[PDB]
């Protein structure tokens, strides 16, 4: 149970951090990380799915004209094998 929120920033690194807190949490997450630097894009990406592989869940990667929106699902459903 949770409301998916929808966190429009233009700095990735504290939408990984907030991402982390409601992963934990076992809450749904969506963030948009609004820029076309590809470099920090890359950042976002590889630590989104980096989390997702730690804690065992999935993410849905979207580009919104040019600005990567990722939700990540903390409560996917029921299956407690580790990945």
Same mark, same amino acid.
Do not use: A, P, R, S
């Given at each position: 149970m949770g409301l998916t929120r929808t966190i429009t920033s233009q700095n990735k690194e504290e939408l990984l951090e907030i991402a982390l +807190? *409601? =992963?934990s @949490? %076992?809450?749904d997450l969506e963030? /948009? *990380?609004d820029s076309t630097d590809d470099k920090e894009i890359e950042e976002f990406e590889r630590?989104? /799915?980096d989390l997702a +592989? +730690?804690?065992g869940v999935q =993410? @849905?990667?979207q580009w919104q %004209?040019?600005?990567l929106r990722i939700r990540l699902k903390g409560s996917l459903e029921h299956h407690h094998h580790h990945h």
């Open positions: +807190k *409601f =992963i @949490q %076992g809450l963030v /948009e *990380f630590d989104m /799915e +592989k +730690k804690t =993410i @849905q990667k %004209g040019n600005k």
